[PDB]
Homo-oligomer: 430 residues x 4
């Protein structure tokens, strides 16, 4: 009596498959995993439930896992991020996926629920992005915890949740922090938003970036990438921060660092990257230049007070999907993107596949680790070993034609390290 899947239109599978074919060729890390483990099926027995934006990239990840032997059931971790042609290709391949662009909140929860129970038994593995699946199980289905061998978590906000849970005796299953592998945080969060933040603002508004003042709240890995992207197109970028170290980094890169109370009067474009609530408020909106564009790229839509706009604007015109233009009592207009949900995935296609290969190779490794070597992972939050982190990167060098240097035995002795690595201490920040 249960649907085998639920997508917007199965008819999009052909276009989706073409999409995955091109993407596969941009994802050597995932392709190399299949080449190494399709034969031995290290994930045989795993029943992986995934909750992570259902995009072309995620479809290649899903099929990599299946190729490695696991059974997979998936849901998106955002109501506007699914790419329907990718979801259809997956559904068609007979993998249970419950996801479509533009879900309601009740449907969003429903979709995650359809992934918990497989044909032959509940999930024994979690692949999360944001902690929603992780929190659902720990709060509504704890009984399933003993049957779950591990959790791998994709993003900063989900990772922070995990540490809050572990600090409070709640975390009941071993978890690998994938966000913090170097090859994820210093590539996906940085270089990925550097390209997909602009993509989302452009597809949504077609606005010229050059000449504009842009305000980026937060200067973490995401803000660093966003600020760099905007400045490369000629915007004057202003940064807001709560952390004196990130603030000093931004100042030393030539950015004016000040508060939102002050910057709201100057910005033409606003991007929130903090992962924190109450960044852009009604008091900020009333000070904004006419047609200021306001978006969020942080995991959850908690940074901008969109409720305030809906309750206080005198007009609200939908320009196209995910693009709303309000008119306030002061007569001025505000362009709001994706109703405040992460703009790169809501208004465009997320990070390009090559960088997502770095993130997802980390994810496959984490799944294998937890599944294949549970004795190595006590309940808590862990990091993939540096040696695996380095392997992720090495798997992407050939595609770029990078010729890496090999330490001579003489050099390796002088440096006190192995010719095959790890080449850095564990506290290295890269």
């Amino acid at each position: 009596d249960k649907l085998p899947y639920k997508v917007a239109d199965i008819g999009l599978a052909a276009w989706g498959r073409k999409a995955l074919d091109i993407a596969e060729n941009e994802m050597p890390g995932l392709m190399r995993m299949r080449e190494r483990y399709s034969a031995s099926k290290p994930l045989k027995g795993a029943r992986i439930a995934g909750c992570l934006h259902m995009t072309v990239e995620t479809a290649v990840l899903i099929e990599t896992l299946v190729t490695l032997g696991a059974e997979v059931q998936w849901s998106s971790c955002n109501i506007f991020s699914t790419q329907d042609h990718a979801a259809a290709a997956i559904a068609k391949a007979g993998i249970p996926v419950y996801a479509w662009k533009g879900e309601t909140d009740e449907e969003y929860l429903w979709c995650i629920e359809q992934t918990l129970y497989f044909k032959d038994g509940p999930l024994n593995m979690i692949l999360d992005d944001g902690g929603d699946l992780t929190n659902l199980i720990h709060t509504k289905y704890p009984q399933l915890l003993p049957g779950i061998r591990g959790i791998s978590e994709e993003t900063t906000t989900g990772v922070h949740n995990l540490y809050k849970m572990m600090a409070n005796g709640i975390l009941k299953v071993p978890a690998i922090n994938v966000n913090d592998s170097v090859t994820k945080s210093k590539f996906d969060n940085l270089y990925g938003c550097r390209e997909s933040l602009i993509d989302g603002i452009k597809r949504a508004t077609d606005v010229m970036i050059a000449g504009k003042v842009a305000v980026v709240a937060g200067y973490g890995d995401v803000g660093k990438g966003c600020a760099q992207a905007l400045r490369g197109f000629g915007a004057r970028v202003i940064i807001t921060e709560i952390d004196p170290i990130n603030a000093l980094q931004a100042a030393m890169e030539g950015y004016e660092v000040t508060t939102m109370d002050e910057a709201c009067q100057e910005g033409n474009i606003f991007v929130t990257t903090t992962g924190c609530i109450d960044i852009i408020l009604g008091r900020h909106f009333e000070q904004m230049k006419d047609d200021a564009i306001v978006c969020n790229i942080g995991h959850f839509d908690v940074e901008i007070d969109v409720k305030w706009l809906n309750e206080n604007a005198v007009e609200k015109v939908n320009i196209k999907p995910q693009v709303d233009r309000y008119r306030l009592k002061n007569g001025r207009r505000i362009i709001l993107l994706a109703e405040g949900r992460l703009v790169n995935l809501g208004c465009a296609m997320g990070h390009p596949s090559f960088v997502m290969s770095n993130s997802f190779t980390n994810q496959v490794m984490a799944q294998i680790e937890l599944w294949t070597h549970p004795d190595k992972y006590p309940v808590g939050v862990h990091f993939l070993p540096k040696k695996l982190d380095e392997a992720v990167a090495e798997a992407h060098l050939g595609k770029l034609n990078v010729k890496l240097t090999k330490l001579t035995e003489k050099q390796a002795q002088y440096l006190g390290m192995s010719c095959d690595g790890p080449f850095k201490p564990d506290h290295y920040r890269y």
Copy 2:
């Protein structure tokens, strides 16, 4: 018995009007022209036939001219550049427009033909982009030349044509070189492609730019913008040039300058910006890395040997409109964008409106000049006066909140110039 217009779908007018509303707010130069001339209608009597990409930006230009009193009939200057919602809004406003995205070559010519004769008499003005309308009249409808008071030309290739015509006694009507106003060539050609080249490559392929080698043929104003855009996202950019000066400029900016025969073996992304034929040939395609992306942003599709691919590939798969992926005898794949037609307009939406306001304010000024002061323009090719060029720029400063400095009389005397300009000699290169 003649159609009053011809567009893809009049039903798109509402969405288009919303598009124009947002764009108008990004185009102060055009809005300020209307504010200054709607009352006096300096273009009353003008019957302007336009041949220029039928986009949201062009629609604001078309309505600015109408507001200034002229009668206008328009066609696109490329078979893939029209934005159907913009064309519909114009058609709906009752302006005769003949344009849609994806015309055949015969239709392309047909559309230009429908603009030559107005309700009350042939065209008395030309607004061209590429020279196609200009060449059609001079070669098939010379009889209409005495009735045409002037020509204003938008782009480098069209301007070059005009000088070839003038050098050969063919040019029969006064022409203003709009491409070479400073506020056009050093803004539209540069900053505009800096943002819309990436937009087109992204919407077409979603490819990661970071980590790639990109080859840009030509280092003129368009190549300069394209190279800068690609390098800002982390691509290693190689430049090809025939001009020792542009080549030295590129080298001094840190770019490797070499030949296409050599670079075709390294590039992952190829962009042609030369305005010249035979840039990328079959011999180059056979040396390319797998899934290399190849596009053109020069006016005409004469830079890449697309015919060679169609005749020599073993497979050709249409991924989506304007995106074709070939498979060659060597087993490797080539992604070709927009069949070789300018990629920013064929795969995306062209330059953003703000920079297009600079170009189109120049165009309106040129029309007024020629129409309103023909005694000032003998047959030949001219430049708008520097004072008007500076006025275009000044009209866009307020939107950006630029506080310009005013020379004191003391300073103006020392510099030997007027406090209100021109502030530069005519040979100034900016």
Copy 3:
């Protein structure tokens, strides 16, 4: 009874010669001129008097001219720009040079006077930088005008003077505008200040640039280079301009454009690049942050009101040559570089030799042109032919290993140009 030369210390000639040896290897344009004309001595008969910063680069120029057969007598065009080891090497080689770092104003004039009369007759050629020699002859020695075949002028300010003179019937000798050859203005003025402005600020103060707000007055070729240099090291750069076009260029590159009245309160570093008087006044100094650094890189020291500081500060401490630190009545301190004279040459060594090879190859060509083909140059101000401008650039490509592309005859026909150039119309701005 006349000195054969006058320098700080002939004993520095050996170190200077070593300097010139290294420089020669960085100046292929000048070396290639010698290789082509030492045999035929096209300048035989020329008695060239030069007034241009007596640096290592200028010494290679002086010897290139001598090698080409002319007789040369030189003076510096600034009291603080001479490089004593270079002046000594020249003096030693037996060329009459009157120059040393740190001349008084009376001495500065005296030195120029010692170059007017040669062993065998007055000067028959002028090589000027700033117009000082040009103005001295036209105002105190007009009688020598009929004997002077030509003038070649190095910089923007001198070129502007020439046009003021020509517009007023004063210019009595043919002059070639060397500043405006493309290979000079778009390389020396831009890329040269991009490297030597920082060099001067650093050798003078050792100040960290990152984190600072820097204010650059003017956004011409010099301001463009200076702004780019400062921003590359992490300074937040604010620009002041009087020209709406340059102001819009700066805004579209992400720079805040405002007035000095406003920026004087924010800057930590101030650089004037306008070529205009009254840029930084006492009213600006009283608003400055403590230890703000203030310098000028424009030709003459007329941009900053240094007299105001000397008359109004409560203290003035010389830190080292060309570096003065004042203390104002408000208790705050101002660091002034080179007493307001061009900072790159006053506090460092000017532009590096490679870019100076572009400028000086232009200068040698101009001398040959005027001297060798006077029938081609009526009284007035002219530009070197584009073909020579392109040759300057081509002569520097090999050193950089640039592989330039050659047009096929097919391509050259399509473009309507010669395979050997000129490749651009005369109004091209590059």
Copy 4:
């Protein structure tokens, strides 16, 4: 019978004091330490022996420590890095300093030896940069170990030594890794070399960077800064790496990553930043373009085979101090800077004072920590607490006019952190 100090010329003290006055104003972190601890003298009782480049910056550090109550004796950690005017000002202030620019190796060791015994008893604290003092005590004066309460270490190479020592039971005293405080490694190593690498190459050679190919070995924090500096001036930068992660970072920033065996044939400028031996060998020198410039910025001069040049060149000409130009059997020339010793300090003045304030505030904190709270530091290698790391940064925000944001209690609860920090987990990489 022992000298009270030993410097090049005490007569330079006045100029040095002026230098320190300017520097103090650029070092708020150190000034704020004095303002907070001069009253309470937390270092009273400490007898700190320092071995760290004797520069203007280090002089402000030395006086900050004295102000905090310690007795200090200093030596430089490099034979060419001392700034004689700074050493003289210190000597004059009556602090025992043994250092001068250009020491022989025997003298270098002698100077360190003069710092071990104070008027009233051996050293009870070490402030090291490179590990030389640390290794001298552990190997020749172990008997003094029980009397030493702590070690604070400045740089990557010294920190690596410490971990090698701790891993081998040799480390006998508690050590704080100062290099790895975030405010040191991500500011001094990066932004500092970004400005002082160019300074050293420029003061030494005056070479144009634009147009050159530069090869940077290593892409750690130092290579990242060096590569960014060179590319900002127009050099094409090639990177060599042994670490797949750093290699992928460099590729994604647009740099070609290859081997030295390959790059030695292309580079015009070579900079080694690896901290490893055998980077540039005789086989590399024989392939180099004429007048290639070769330097090292890593701690010890072990990266370049300078011995090979001295033994194999046919000529060796000293251009000026720290600049040697060789001529090889193949007729080509090699410019070697500072005989291979760190170029920023050997040929220029090291990092500017502002960034050095970040490093030295960390150093003062470490000294206070170890001295004042030894119960908190067991034998081993430790990190300063994140809260102190953040305080270093906050102490430099005011000088830059940074307006930092304060978390509301609501926000701090949502983020699960204190309004006053730490704002990041311990594994954060910034």
